[PDB]
Design a binder for these strands. Sequence first.
DNA 1: ATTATGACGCT
DNA 2: AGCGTCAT
Length: 430
Amino acid sequence: GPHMATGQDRVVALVDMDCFFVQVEQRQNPHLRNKPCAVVQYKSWKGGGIIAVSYEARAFGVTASMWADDAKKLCPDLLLAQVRESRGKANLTKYREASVEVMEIMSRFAVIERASIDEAYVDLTSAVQERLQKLQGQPISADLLPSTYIEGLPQGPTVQKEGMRKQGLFQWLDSLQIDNLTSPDLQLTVGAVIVEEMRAAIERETGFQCSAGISHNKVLAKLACGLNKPNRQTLVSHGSVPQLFSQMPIRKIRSLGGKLGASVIEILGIEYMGELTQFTESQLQSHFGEKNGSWLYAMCRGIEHDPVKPRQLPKTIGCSKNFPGKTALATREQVQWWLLQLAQELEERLTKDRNDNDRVATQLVVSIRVQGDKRLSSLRRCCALTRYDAHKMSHDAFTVIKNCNTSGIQTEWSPPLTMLFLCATKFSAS
DNA sequence: ATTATGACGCT
DNA sequence: AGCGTCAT
Ligand SMILES: Nc1ncnc2c1ncn2[C@H]1C[C@H](O)[C@@H](COP(=O)(O)OP(=O)(O)OP(=O)(O)O)O1
Ligand SMILES: [Ca+2]
Ligand SMILES: [Mg+2]
């Protein structure tokens, strides 16, 4: 009853760029704008691998994880932009730099958590309290929410999508009770006003469009964001959760898309998030562990407490390359040449990071994969990172892995290496 | 031959 | 620490 917390204490948004690497390439090359197009890395094997797809191209069935040659079968006029190659490998610098553009604009409105290269969480609780006082109990006009969807509305007593959006928004606003400065629904609404402003700023200042979700926590904000992509934002209220979750496959919720989510489904014999409510907290803890059990018990009620971390910068800087199939590294000097290439890119990124961000990495992590294994990593080893020098780092990397070499001859490498990975970690201020 | 990343959990 | 899971 009155003591039952409802997880409505915060306003959290998740902002996710639409088709992000494609938009980065479309800004650069106007010929690609408003076209079926995709971003591809490498080319020789099956046309290259697609890693981003414009919404026009998605209409033909083109997806990421698809080979370009197969995508071209679905969409013959598909336009392609290639990821830059440097020192023999894909280089994602253009997209990392575009990410920084967006992250810095968002940071003007509130403290953000960088969740990926193209999305960030925002805790807007304080900002909402602020805007609420300047409003002075003045109603929120629909005009302040021109791209907002209210999930679950309209309901009850039509052809158009935009017409439906406004119908829902009007029902929402008509029911709002703006006299209450602590009404969670009002707080979410003001949150949505701020996110309209944030998203307008991003588009004005970068040319990039994005979607967003506004709710009371990170998981609901993330889920909300995807409900109306692209170029729209969605408010998921606490009240909307029972209907939303009643038909929501468990795998859709962030962290449940893998083995844990499959286990929830198998063990409990359920399909939808809402079905979790019928279990006690102790029951869920018994199957999934103390932390997961408590998390699930609250999450299926729309409640989650994970804070938006004040972290705008990545915690690690890494360089990785696969050597598939026949290209697997079978000689020592192959291994050393590629360790150097990776180390040279790593040094480049590390030196720029030190200048920009006043920090220095102190630990180097070296990872390889051997032909045979289908784990991502076969072996992970750390060593000290004392100097930003590629030759030193590549020599150090070689030292920590050289005994993985089974071949009695030391010119050769067996089994051949199908992956190298260098990662700089454990930053300190400098 | 679904690549190049990046965060967080377990023991 | 090294490994696994999940994610984009
Ligand atoms: N598995 C991956 N491998 C390599 N790059 C990826 C992968 N997934 C995503 N990316 C890159 C390319 C994406 O443009 C970018 C952001 O990913 P993501 O948000 O999932 O899709 P997207 O921004 O391209 O489309 P949208 O968000 O509109 O569905 O990160
Ligand atoms: Ca995105
Ligand atoms: Mg994303």
